[PDB]
A paper describes a structure:
The ordered assembly of tau protein into amyloid filaments defines a number of neurodegenerative diseases, also known as tauopathies; they are the most common proteinopathies of the human nervous system. The physiological function of tau is to promote the assembly, and possibly stability, of microtubules. Here, we used cryo-EM to determine the structures of heparin-induced filaments assembled from recombinant full-length 4R tau (2N4R, 441 amino acid isoform) and the corresponding 3R isoform (2N3R, 410 amino acid isoform) to resolutions sufficient for de novo atomic modelling. Our results show that heparin-induced 2N4R filaments consist of a mixture of at least four different conformations, whereas heparin-induced 2N3R filaments mainly adopt a single conformation.
Snake filaments have a crossover distance of 650 Å and vary in width between 40 and 100 Å. A pronounced offset of the centre of the ordered core from the helical axis explains the sigmoidal appearance of the filaments in projection. The structure has a helical twist of −1.26°, an overall resolution of 3.3 Å, and a clear separation of β-strands along the helical axis. The ordered core of the snake filament comprises residues 272–330, i.e. the last three residues of R1, all of R2 and most of R3. In the core, there are six β-strands, three from R2: β1 (274–280), β2 (282–291) and β3 (295–298), and three from R3: β4 (305–310), β5 (313–321) and β6 (327–330). Four of these strands form two stacks of cross-β, with β1 packing against β5 and β2 against β4. A broad, hammerhead-like arc, harbouring β3, connects β2 to β4. The hammerhead arc represents a new type of chain direction reversal in tau filaments, different from the triangular β-helix of the Alzheimer fold, and the tighter U-turns of the Pick fold. Most of the positively charged side-chains are exposed on the filament surface, where they face diffuse external densities (indicated by yellow arrows), presumably corresponding to negatively charged groups of heparin.
Numbering used by the authors:
A (entry chain B), B (entry chain A), C (entry chain C): 272 to 330
């Protein structure tokens, strides 16, 4: 058959926080969570594929 | 047959927070959750596919 | 047959928070939930597909 694959994976911000079996005392704690900021992102890409014919031809 | 695949995966902000079996005391805690901000994003991409014929032709 | 696939997955903000079997005391806690803000997003993309014929032709 013949495949053409063009794959763009750009911006990924992942954040995995876990606590298990915690028997603790917490007092006066700022900034314990999570923050994700993306500021003024411009995504100006071009993707072309000048391709021939596909499928089945008989003569 | 013949495939053409063009895939753009751009902006992904994932956030996974979990707590299991927590037997704890929490006092005066700011910023424990999660924040996701995207500010003024401009997505100005072009994707073309000048392609031939597809399917089945007989002569 | 012959496929053409053009896929744009752009902005994804996911947020998964879970608590299991929690036997705890919580006092005076701001910002425990979740926030998702998208500010002034402009999505100005172009996608073309100058393609040939599809299907079945006989001569």
């Amino acid at each position: 058959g013949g495949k053409v694959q063009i794959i763009n994976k750009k911006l990924d911000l992942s954040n995995v926080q876990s606590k298990c079996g915690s028997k603790d005392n917490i007092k006066h704690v700022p900034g314990g969570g999570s923050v994700q900021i993306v500021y003024k992102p411009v995504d100006l890409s071009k993707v072309t594929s000048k391709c021939g014919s596909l499928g089945n031809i008989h003569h």
